[PDB]
Design a binder for these strands. Structure first.
Ligand SMILES: Nc1ncnc2c1ncn2[C@@H]1O[C@H](COP(=O)(O)OP(=O)(O)OP(=O)(O)O)[C@@H](O)[C@H]1O
Ligand SMILES: Nc1ncnc2c1ncn2[C@@H]1O[C@H](COP(=O)(O)OP(=O)(O)O)[C@@H](O)[C@H]1O
Ligand SMILES: [Mg+2]
Ligand SMILES: [Mg+2]
Lengths: 113, 244, 221, 232
DNA sequence: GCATGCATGCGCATGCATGCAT
DNA sequence: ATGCATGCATGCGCATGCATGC
């Protein structure tokens, strides 16, 4: 939040006081920014599943709002990926993965009906 | 809160009726309440009471009786409790959450004036050789029941706080009124589920009565007749339409 | 005397309302709707009472609910500064002015006094409440009776009194989970009860969506 | 309990136990009866009241002033108090017996314990209402008309609250719709309307059931408002 | 299973009133 | 004759025990 901005300003002032300089220069701001970033720790649980789910939700909601079935969705996703997959083995593996993910989303997560 | 020549009346009535004395006394207990002959007989037995016995070894045998009434709403239990309160000489009403264990049982307070510790009597201590009526008995907490257990067993209260210890007499009798856990008495379920009380508490009670509001047309007709006859009544010597 | 003429001349301006709306909270960036609602609350309305049977109040109570870091307290501080009779209090505790009336010997003057709540002291004024969801049972009951009946009844230490509490209430609050969820209703996102929410005329919802341009402008300010 | 009344659910909308409910003499239930023509009347009435509050404060048609009404009520309460008569007592006896028998029959047929029982307390409440009606006229004895009015009021309030054919018919429609619908299937509103009109049920009941299901969240709109689908 | 709300004893100092020993 | 120690509330600060609510 903005409290982080105030903390950054305070840390820059503290660093300037430490170095006895009369003005705040970008080095102190960079140090404060680095320290604040190192303070934050990411949560460990998966990202690929979230990205695929978000893409599916975005596509389905765009289709619904602008104006398909499960097979149509899978075909559209494969068509979009076409430029990214070079071999048939990877294509079929990704197809199985997305089919399982869609089944989980429809049945387990209840996100899609 | 006695006459002189009513002794002759008492002697004549006794020597005449003999066996019918108990039946007539039970029947005329409360005209305002219709039915419930066994409950009236039990209340009369409470009014009369048993005999306390003391033996050579100092053992004590209780002589008081305890009765618990359970039933559907609007079966005139609170009315009976109020009538007992009015008629009994030393009658004390104590509802479920109205008084706690410290109020029912005497306590110790340190006097600031002299620095000593004194005893303040509780509700049951005051009602020696009397009657204590407890409406909404089911709402009472477990600890209060445990405290009441000693009085119901031997009619004595033991108190001890460092520097003072005493035993007070609590030879009293208890009326209790409670509602079923389900609000209305379920006919199909066993009485154990409906009452929902531990075996020790029921055992320490002497009599258990179950009252039901059976919607029989003849009983309803008789009850309505009695209720409206009582409601239409006006005291003699009072002008009709007078306020109060 | 000349002030009245100046006010009348200002009222003749075609954009007086926009000027008044923009004047509130100069140090707070954005939130035009909040400022407009606060202006409407400050100007107020007119109570009505046909005979002595049906009373209708004219005060406009305002409730703001928002995520942390949205400067909810600054609006309350500015309103306290502007208002001639404004009483500020917090539901967290250790407030300078209490929210419940009581009779006590004052620690300073050592005299037997009856101190009323902030609602009574704010009669014909403004009452600002911060941390509206941290209140206890007594404060909630007092606020409910002051908002419904517009009066406070006291029965303590042999004293039985009824006091008027005609005031306008402005409150600030945060969501239950620390972040507003659009998928749920406003009632489900606040610890308050429906009858309390129903009293407020204006409800404002503040969110912290990441807009790079707005964030850059706020940082510059 | 749920914040707004659910007509089809009937009971379980009251959290109070039957014990505390037996003490109350009368229980009234108010619902938001949504009529297009009614809302306009309410809005116009409110606006007219707001406008006329500033100018005039006068009785509409012979209405008593607040102070006069207060003094009159106090005088009536202080002065006299009436009691019932024999014929009214017999009529009330017959009506109470019939009502209790009907309540027992309804409880047996519905196979569910009513949350609003009928006991001697209700009879005493009716007696009290009749006595109040007689007291209102300063008469020393009540008449049959007062008893009839008290019985009408007690019926309209208590029997309507407790018995809460329209609602049973709505329950029938709800059961039929639950049996016909399936999870994940789509149904057109016209199909439902045609199916239930061929069964000769009123359209308003169907619309009310659909609105209640929408409130609960079982029914959702797929394509605009023409086709519905079932959720849980 | 524990922290907290609500009495209650403990120890103390402080203020207001009065009653008379040096 | 006069100034002071004491009896009687009352605030202050504290610890301790009983009940309950999550
Ligand atoms: N629009 C804004 N313009 C200027 N400063 C802002 C703005 N929004 C937030 N701030 C700053 O954010 C800081 C956060 O403190 P502030 O008291 O305003 O927070 P708050 O919204 O009341 O938070 P809390 O939810 O913790 O009570 C303040 O120093 C304030 O100046
Ligand atoms: N058998 C009966 N005869 C006469 N009156 C009755 C009878 N049963 C109930 N009533 C009336 O109904 C009321 C019941 O109230 P109450 O005694 O408080 O019920 P409960 O004690 O079961 O809660 C009483 O005022 C009483 O006048
Ligand atoms: Mg009773
Ligand atoms: Mg704040």
């Amino acid at each position: 939040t903005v409290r982080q901005l105030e903390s950054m300003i305070r840390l820059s002032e503290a660093m300037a006081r430490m170095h006895c300089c009369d003005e705040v220069q970008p080095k102190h701001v960079k140090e404060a920014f680095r320290l604040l970033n190192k303070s934050i720790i990411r949560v460990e649980t998966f990202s690929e599943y979230c990205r695929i789910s978000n893409l599916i939700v975005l596509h389905l909601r765009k289709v619904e709002e602008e104006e398909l079935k499960r097979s149509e969705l899978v075909n559209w996703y494969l068509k979009e990926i076409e430029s990214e997959i070079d071999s048939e083995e990877e294509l079929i593996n990704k197809k199985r993965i997305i089919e399982k993910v869609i089944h989980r989303l429809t049945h387990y997560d209840h996100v899609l009906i | 809160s006695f006459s002189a020549e009513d002794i002759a009346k008492i002697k004549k009535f006794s020597k005449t009726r003999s066996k019918d004395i108990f039946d007539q006394l039970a029947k005329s207990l409360a005209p305002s309440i219709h039915g419930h002959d066994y409950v009236k007989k039990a209340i009369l037995c409470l009014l009369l009471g048993g005999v306390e016995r003391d033996l050579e070894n100092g053992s004590h045998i209780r002589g008081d009786i305890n009765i618990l009434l359970i039933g559907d709403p609007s079966v005139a239990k609170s009315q009976l409790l109020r009538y007992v309160l009015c008629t009994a000489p030393r009658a004390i009403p104590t509802t479920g959450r109205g008084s706690s264990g410290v109020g029912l049982t005497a306590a110790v307070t340190t006097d600031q004036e002299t620095g000593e510790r004194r005893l303040e009597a509780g509700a049951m201590v005051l009602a020696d050789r009397g009657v204590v009526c407890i409406d909404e008995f089911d709402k009472m907490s477990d600890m209060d029941r445990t405290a009441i257990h000693e009085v119901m067993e031997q009619g004595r209260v033991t108190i001890a706080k460092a520097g003072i210890h005493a035993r007070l007499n609590a030879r009293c009798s208890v009326l209790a009124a409670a509602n079923p856990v389900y609000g209305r008495y379920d006919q199909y379920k066993t009485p154990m589920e409906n009452i929902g009380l531990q075996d020790s508490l029921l055992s320490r009670f002497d009599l258990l009565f179950i009252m039901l509001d059976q919607m029989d047309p003849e009983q309803d007709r008789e009850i309505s007749d009695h209720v409206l006859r009582m409601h239409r009544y006006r005291a003699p010597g009072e002008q009709d339409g007078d306020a109060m | 005397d000349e002030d009245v003429k100046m006010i009348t001349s200002l009222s003749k301006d075609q954009q007086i309302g926009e000027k008044i709306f923009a004047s509130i909270a100069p140090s707070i960036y954005g939130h035009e709707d909040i400022k407009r609602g606060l202006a409407l609350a400050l100007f107020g309305g007119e109570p009505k009472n046909p005979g002595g049977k049906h009373k209708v109040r004219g005060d406009i109570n305002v409730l703001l609910c928002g995520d942390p870091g949205t400067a909810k307290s600054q609006f309350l501080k500015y309103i306290e500064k502007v208002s001639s009779r404004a009483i500020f209090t917090t539901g967290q505790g250790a407030s300078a002015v209490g929210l419940t009336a009581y009779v006590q010997r004052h620690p300073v003057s050592r005299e037997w006094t009856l101190e009323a709540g902030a609602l009574v002291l704010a009669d014909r004024g403004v009452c600002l409440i911060d941390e509206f969801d941290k209140m206890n049972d007594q404060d909630r009951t007092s606020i409910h009776e002051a908002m419904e009946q517009q009066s406070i009844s006291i029965s303590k230490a042999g004293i039985v009194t009824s006091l008027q509490a005609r005031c306008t209430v402005i409150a600030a609050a945060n969501p239950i989970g620390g972040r507003y969820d659009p998928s749920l209703t406003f009632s489900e996102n606040v610890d308050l009860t429906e009858p309390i929410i129903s009293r407020f005329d204006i409800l404002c919802v503040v969110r912290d969506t990441v807009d790079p341009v707005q964030d850059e402008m706020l940082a510059r300010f | 309990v749920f914040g707004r009344w659910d007509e089809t659910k009937g009971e379980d909308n009251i959290d109070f136990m039957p014990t505390i409910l037996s003490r109350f003499d009368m229980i009234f239930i108010v619902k938001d009866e949504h009529n297009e023509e009614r809302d306009v009347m309410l809005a116009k009435h409110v606006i007219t009241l707001h406008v006329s509050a500033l100018t005039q404060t006068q009785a509409v048609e012979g209405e008593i002033d607040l102070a006069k009404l207060k003094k009159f009520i106090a005088y009536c309460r202080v002065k006299c108090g009436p009691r019932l008569s024999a014929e009214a007592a017999e009529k009330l006896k017959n009506r109470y017996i019939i009502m209790r028998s009907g309540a027992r029959q309804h409880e047996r047929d519905s196979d569910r314990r009513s949350s609003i029982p009928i006991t001697v307390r209700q009879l005493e409440a009716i007696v009290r209402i009749a006595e109040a009606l007689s007291k209102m006229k300063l008469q020393p004895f009540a008449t049959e008309a007062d008893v009839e009015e008290a019985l009408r009021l007690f019926q309209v309030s208590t029997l309507d609250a407790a018995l809460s054919e329209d609602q049973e018919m709505l329950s029938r429609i709800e059961k039929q719709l639950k049996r016909r619908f399936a999870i994940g299937s789509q149904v057109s509103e016209h199909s439902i309307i045609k199916d239930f009109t061929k069964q000769k049920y009123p359209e308003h009941a169907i619309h009310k059931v659909l609105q209640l299901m929408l409130r609960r969240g079982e029914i959702q709109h797929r394509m605009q408002r023409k086709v519905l689908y079932r959720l849980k």
